[PDB]
Amino acid sequence: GRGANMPFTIMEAESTSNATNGTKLTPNFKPGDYAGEASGRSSVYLDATGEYVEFTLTSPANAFVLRNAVAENTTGTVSIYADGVSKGKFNVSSKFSYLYATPSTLGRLGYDNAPGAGLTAYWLYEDAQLMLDQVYPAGTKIKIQKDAGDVSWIYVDLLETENVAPPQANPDPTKYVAVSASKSIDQALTEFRQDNTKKGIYIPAGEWTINSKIFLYGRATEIVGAGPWYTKLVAPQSQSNTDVGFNISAAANGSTIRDLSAWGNYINRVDGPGKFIDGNGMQNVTVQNIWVEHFVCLYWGVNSSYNTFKNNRIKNTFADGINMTNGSSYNVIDNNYARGTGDDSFALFSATGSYNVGNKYTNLTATNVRRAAAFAVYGGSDNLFQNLYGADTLTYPGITISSYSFGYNTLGFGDQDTVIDGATLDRTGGDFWTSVGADDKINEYQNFGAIWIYGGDRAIKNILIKNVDINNPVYFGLMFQSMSPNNMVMQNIRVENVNINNPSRYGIKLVVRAEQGQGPAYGGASFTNVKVNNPGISAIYGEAQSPNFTVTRVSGNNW
Ligand SMILES: [Ca+2]
Q: Which parts of the sequence bind Ca(2+) (predicted)?
């Protein structure tokens, strides 16, 4: 792509291709800011009746997602036009946006949705979904316009456009027990469990309350919807933070959940509950073509292996999108799109079995990461991250590569490579933690590059980063750092075929003193065909001050 191959096209409102009589925001990298938090770091602000932004379709579309910001605690409309003719109203809302913290308490991002004395609002954008009764061809002018009776003001960030096929029917009513207006999901599963001729259940187009965690057991179960635009599992929207979804017991290893959406009711992060799918230790489970929003996570695996997560959309969550932890091995995390996660969008956390091994995170997109990284790998061995697109992180790298234990029982990285191969990272990095007594001090925070290679308290070894384009990172392209006093020696760290374009500070930073008590990096890294283009200050910082870190310029470096 790079990244996931999705049927929807992402179009930025602020494109110079888009006529507008509204106000185009100049970009910045600030959390809590309507530009800093926008995709592309810009949006078009509509603030008077008749103000519009005009998109042009580049593929046919009958369905649309409008990423937007409106006033806190409000709902209303904004209008959609096709070739100058009005066609409907988006239902725009800040029900799930505006999370409160302070600049010195960004660890609270996502945890508190209530305004309060001294608190600043963050996580300002949210989405409106709308299907129209016609497929419009490429070249159609799709105008978002503020008409009389629409909201007082709205920031228009981007538009998804998609040509959604008609809903798919029950594949076979004699094999898939249908959920219906008078037969619940649980009742259909009971009929399935008790009749061995059934393969699973079918959930038709419609809105279906999920007010519980739905347990899958007995045997491998198929759960099949009509398509994610059509089958909507809905947490009770007059409640908040209800732990609902599926929980897959061991007897239902080998299950498949596909072709549906799930609309949670979380308005803040909670730690433990809130994953749409629970499945601790699950094996051979497939989760495919589902669209989930407003949960804490889609899935947080614990010693979960041989699973497949494919073609999913994970948007506007309060922590990670998908994390696989504590022994999770041989998983296929392929062709998934995440936008607006509340912690690491796609993560792998290795802990003691010894390592998470053999995982393949491929063709992944993670954008508008509202806290932490687009992609994060914490230890492990023989894991592949391939064809990634990451962009617009609020607080942290595009890719975190870290051997910090976080206090858990882990050995760090193992004896086979952790590979990042093929990645584009646009406007990644950000501010987090504090930098009291730091070298190279530019503000009150620590400052994170597009890729952070962090040796923590465990082994940091066998890391291959290749075929990466880093465009306009907030601060740096590559940032290497060793935790003191552990000073783990970085070994077999190699960087190949990397372009670092317009970093505001440095192409490469070797962190010399992150904060009081910390020192420079230990070990070294090799660089082959790594280009640093137009750095704000200099191509590399920290090399002379890092006498125990060896930069090896193999060939092809312009620095
Ligand atoms: Ca935008």
A: 12, 14, 39, 42, 157
Q: Which residue has the tokens 């963050």?
A: 122
Distance CA 331, CA 236 (A): 32
If you measure from the C-alpha of residue 87 to the centroid of ligand 1, how many angstroms do you get, rounded to a whole number?
Answer: 23
Count of domains observed in the chain: 1
> Which residues are registered as beta bridge partners of 446?
432
Residues closing a segment before a gap in the chain (C–N exceeding 2.5 Å): 352
Query: Is 554 part of a structural domain of the chain?
Result: no
Distance CA 310, CA 330 (A): 14
Q: Known binder of ligand: residue 104? A: no
Q: Is 313 helix (H, G, I), strand (E, B) or coil?
A: strand
Residue 9 CA, ligand 1 centroid: distance in Å: 13
The amino acid at 106 = L
- Three-state SS at 107: helix
State yes or no: 126 annotated in a binding site.
Answer: no
Q: ∠355-361-366 over CA atoms, to 5°?
A: 125
How far is 72 from 93, CA to CA, in rounded Å? 8
Q: Which residues pair with 216 in a beta bridge?
A: 248
For 201, list phi and psi in degrees, rounded to 5.
Answer: -130, 155
Distance of CA 269 to the CA centre of its chain: 15
Distance (Å, whole) CA 510 – CA 425: 20
Residues 6+ apart with CB under 8 A from 194: none
Q: State which residues form the domain around 156.
A: 9-162
Kindly state whether residue 290 falls inside one of the protein's structural domains: no
Task: Please state, in angstroms and rounded to a whole number, the distance separating the CA atoms of residues 231 and 167.
Answer: 9
Give distance in angstroms: CA of 492 to centre of ligand 1: 39
Determine, yes or no, domain membership for 548: no
Q: Is 37 annotated as a binding residue?
A: no
Ligand 1 centroid, distance to 74 Cα (angstroms): 21
The helix/strand/coil state of 294 is: coil
Report resolution in angstroms: 1.6
Report whether 42 belongs to an annotated binding site.
Answer: yes
**16 CB contacts (<8 Å, ≥6 apart)?**
none
Q: How far is CA 498 from CA 421, 464, 510, 558, in A?
A: 10, 12, 17, 11
Q: Quick count: other Cβ atoms within 10 Å of Cβ 480?
A: 30
How remote is the CA of residue 508 from the centroid of ligand 1, in Å?
Answer: 28
Whats the size of the chain, residue-wise? Answer: 559
Check if the beta carbon of residue 309 is closer than 8 Å to that of residue 337. no
C-alpha to C-alpha distance for 173 and 198, rounded to whole angstroms:
9
In a domain, 217, yes or no: no
Q: Which residues contact 181 (CB under 8 A, 6 or more apart)?
A: none
| Domain harbouring 42, CATH code | 2.60.120.260
Distance of CA 378 to the CA centre of its chain: 17
**Annotation-wise, does 39 bind a ligand?**
yes
